[PDB]
């Protein structure tokens, strides 16, 4: 009954709000079969690779040292995929720790959690800056 | 490995610019 | 219990993007054949209000939308392709690059595909979702 | 850059598809210097002879009364000839107007059209049933 | 501006087929001499997968392929020969008939030759393409 | 009219089964 856009828009609201308010809980959007693919180099200098599941996604989020991270959403697209999922494409700008803005895109695939009605989790998250 | 309703090799042939006659 | 030549998500996504954009350059009137019924498609654009254009649905609407877009000698520079398994044996593909229509200037784009198996034909995927936006209509 | 088999296989696909869908356009595969040699008797009862060029090939195709003509391709060979041509040998079975199948071979010589890159036309077409 | 004794495509094709198959019957170790460099040759056969065998290229490979085929007292019954001019002063020849090797049973075949002038020696053609398939390996 | 690198009359001679000596 909820349209894919009603789901996707509210997801984007909650996700980027939590990224700003409590990044140490962002992993709770994800599940055991989730993949989190945030592209680019750390520094460090090592290349980016997919991390799987809540526990590892939590460790990866914490390694990114998000502080007061702000997002300017410039466009959201959200469509029904198969099996009652929702695919979301976000285009925006992100400022972490009050640093200069950078453009990004982020693709999510949201999947029903199964038991609770209209509960979704993030099955796929692919993020890349456009530098 | 193919996509859509394309037959094997069909995309590669069309994407190479192959055409026949004056249609 | 194992399919030892089953293509990985990475190979599916890479070959798909290659086939999609090589076909776009030479035979865009065939692009609709990548799409299934109830597929969604949007390829940038701005409506009369100047807000981004809405998606169309189904191979019929998609064929009409593609042909209204007048792709002619469409050149692409693909910068990033990232492909991962989704649920139900799908593959989600994120694409970033630049696209030039009619030998006009290159325009940066951000795109997501969702590919899904036809249902049973072995190693056959259709495009279920195609979200494409030009950065110059958003940023 | 296209191999002879990439060309020949796609030619066979298009040719026999059009034979089924719109035989009244088959002549558009040919040119003014093309020869079309479909062996055997009409009925009528007159022997077969070569016809030259699109206009006459169109008349000959129409005289054959193709209706819903189906082809079962059993083997295709395609090789580079000189001057960037492609020689194709098809072995198959043909059912016209839902009649019983008959074995055939068909030899084509495909030649570049000259102006457009990777455009070919049928310079030679020799067809015979094996009855 | 006219060569009043230039052989027609029909005569070229007829005499060629005659020379080719009469030589095959008596001196198959000379058959390779009909072929130029970059000639293509396939003469039926099935690979380890049971798919039809691939062509070989060049007079060196061709000589080796012919000698591996062990033609011995090879009898032919030619049923149809059809020969027409191609571009660049070539001749394409379609051949149907039956061939028996080593006094074994006759096998039907379907064959195409492309003949091409050597370059300049007057009325001299080589075999540029030889496609031969036994019907019993296809039908 | 000749084919390949055969000389005039050479195919006809060889195709007739002509051979010489014990080689
Ligand atoms: K926190
Ligand atoms: K939708
Ligand atoms: K018709
Ligand atoms: K070849």
Numbering used by the authors:
A (entry chain B), D (entry chain B): 5 to 135
B (entry chain C), F (entry chain C): 449 to 471
C (entry chain A), E (entry chain A): 0 to 138
List sentences quoted exactly from the publication behind this structure.
Thus, we determined the crystal structure of the NTF2-like domain of G3BP-1 in complex with a significantly longer peptide (25 amino acids) derived from SFV nsP3 that comprises both FGDF motifs. Each NTF2-like domain of the G3BP-1 dimer is composed of three α-helices αI–αIII lined up against a β-sheet created by five β-strands βI–βV that are superimposable onto each other through a 180° rotation around the rotational axis of the two domains. The initial electron density map obtained after molecular replacement was of excellent quality and clearly revealed the bound nsP3SFV-derived peptide with residues Glu-C458 to Ala-C463 (EVDALA) adopting a central helical stretch and the FGDF motifs presented at the termini for interaction with G3BP-1. The N-terminal FGDF motif of the nsP3 peptide (FGDFN) comprising residues Phe-C451 to Phe-C454 bound to the previously identified FGDF binding site of (G3BP-1)2 in the same asymmetric unit, while the C-terminal FGDF motif (FGDFC) comprising residues Phe-C468 to Phe-C471 bound to the corresponding site of a symmetry-related molecule. Thus, a single nsP3SFV-25 peptide engages two (G3BP-1)2 subunits, as previously suggested, but also leads to a poly-complex of (G3BP-1)2 molecules interconnected by nsP3SFV-25 through crystal symmetry operations, indicating an oligomer-inducing function for nsP3. Furthermore, the region between FGDFN and FGDFC adopts a helical conformation with the two FGDF motifs at the N- and C-termini of the helix, excluding the possibility that both FGDF motifs bind to the same G3BP-1 dimer due to the short length of the helical region. Each of the two FGDF motifs of nsP3SFV-25, FGDFN and FGDFC, bound to the same hydrophobic pocket between helices αI and αII on G3BP-1 as well as its symmetry mate G3BP-1*, with conformations highly similar to the previously determined G3BP-2:LTFGDFDE complex. However, the binding of nsP3SFV and G3BP-1 is predominantly achieved through interactions mediated through FGDFN and FGDFC, which bind to the same hydrophobic pockets on two separate symmetry-related (G3BP-1)2 molecules. The G3BP-1:nsP3SFV-25 crystal structure also indicated that almost the entire helical spacer region of nsP3SFV-25 interacts with G3BP-1, resulting in a buried peptide surface area of 66% (with buried surface areas in blue).
The G3BPs are multifunctional RNA-binding proteins with a major regulatory role in the formation of SGs. G3BPs are organized into two globular domains, the Nuclear Transport Factor 2-like (NTF2) and the RNA Recognition Motif (RRM) domains, and structurally disordered regions with low amino acid complexity. However, the major function of G3BP appears to be in the nucleation of SGs, for which it is critical. The alphaviruses target SG responses by sequestering G3BP via two conserved FGDF motifs localized in the C-terminal hypervariable domain (HVD) of nsP3, exemplified for SFV.
